[PDB]
């Protein structure tokens, strides 16, 4: 079995191009969630999977935003930067419904050695989505879903293997759901069709995945801005929508990939992966609300955006083992390629609709005005290309009890834009990694790593002493020290880390030829301690979660103005706890569940003069699983934000947004 006691977490995960590694063999803080856990949470997106019990992950928790939004180790981790089966550029751009995945894997911290630079250059962590393939036994499950107030849905999952040796597999997933959600005047529509094909040969293997997805929100949440002069007013009740009720966002995503492996011997393997995807995004609504008085007056400017992006992606390489003296080597060498082309259509100012719409956030009957026709004109075409070449070796001493991993990767990046007159060139950087793992016993591992993340370099403006200079890719740097303990059915991780991340800015205090200079002297430093755990500490009980302390400090900022201040948006303290308790009832198993998610305050600006308080959220759940004439049936009921706590937290692009209100979810599932 791959799965740990309880069924919710897997025992191994993909560690970029080092491939599959077990929990106690992995000198990084990783976790992998099963499809069972996904169905048990009734998760509708990736955030609801990876944020529920992990204290190193934070979301502002808004309902029906234009994308998912989460941080890992106190840094942004962009939805653009998820991998599928280890390959970037395939998954949906902004929001991914998790019906098509057998695992959701999280690797905490930056990982450029392992993965290369993902398209948006975030460095918080890597989320890897592993698709489903057909199990040996024919399989068909139908599930009907409900989410308050009036969203109804279904999901069908069928699988079957063919050939004399079941060497071919086919796995199909289909999902649709539609209707009013828990926020007033907001509705959500989701559609997925997916396909997982595989062929197992004697010396060779091929895996194909393709999918078609739709995500649509009417009454999309955009959030709102505040100033120090006016203040942050008390949050309205939690089901309030503070963006136009006619506003909407729609993302269509299509993707396909193929992987191939060829075993030359038991010591040498080649592999290749190729994929492509398409994203069509449209948005019509507020570009931002602004709170203009302490009585709750709100001023919302309107904007429109569409973009189309075509992506291509590849990763090919060789893996091998050999021995020298009493040292075992496991090596890999790979090359990656990513390219996208993009068209952007946009109104900054919409004709007829440049006067902002004036409301009050506490109003039960806001007048949002008419809905402008959607006609954004073409603005610019843009491209992004990346490529990389990586080498690594894992050396093992003393019967596999000491493992030293060394490697490096060369990374190249180039961006173009059809409205940029400044020069456009590729830039490169070399990023090393080293990680040490010691097995004290066969139940206890201690580990340390140094590893980097990469972000494309900014370009100096025409106003600067160094006008049009393009910086090389910028290096985020992690040191980590950790301890892992597997007691058998229950496991612990304790880790400490320090991660520095640079930023770049125009600096009026460093004059060259009497002009401001563009520099990469900016720095944020996140130090943290994480204690987390999972599994079944007693019979019939499951328990997952942990506690983190995080110190996310702006150590160097423009002019020194904000030196020593705390980073925006993320909390310093998190405690999360998910529990499940099983009990035999009639002809089936009843499970009760509860979650608590407690966080401390967050700063809203880098001056640290505005903040929002901490908050504690509770969720409860019941689940009944039985057979009806010998067919497995599972009934599920959940309530999220049970106390209907109203809270502000920080999303992308704007200062504040309301967290999701109390939400009920029901589902029933039936195996044929």
Residue numbers in the entry: 32 to 703
What's the paper's own text on this?
Residues 33 to 703 of the protein are well defined in the electron density map, while the N-terminal region comprising the TonB box is missing, presumably because it is flexible. The asymmetric unit contains three monomers arranged around a threefold symmetry axis reminiscent of the porin arrangement and thus plausibly biologically meaningful. PISA, a computational assessment of oligomeric state in the crystal, suggests a trimer with a high degree of confidence. Size Exclusion Chromatography coupled to Multi-Angle Light Scattering (SEC-MALS) analysis in C8E4 is consistent with monomer whilst native gel shows the protein runs more closely to a dimer; however, the detergent bound to the protein may increase the apparent weight suggesting a monomer in solution.
BauA has the typical outer-membrane TonB-dependent transporter (TBDT) fold with a β-barrel formed by 22 antiparallel strands, several extracellular loops, and a plug domain folded inside of the barrel. Acinetobactin is synthesized as a precursor, preacinetobactin, which rearranges non-enzymatically and irreversibly at pH >7 to give acinetobactin.
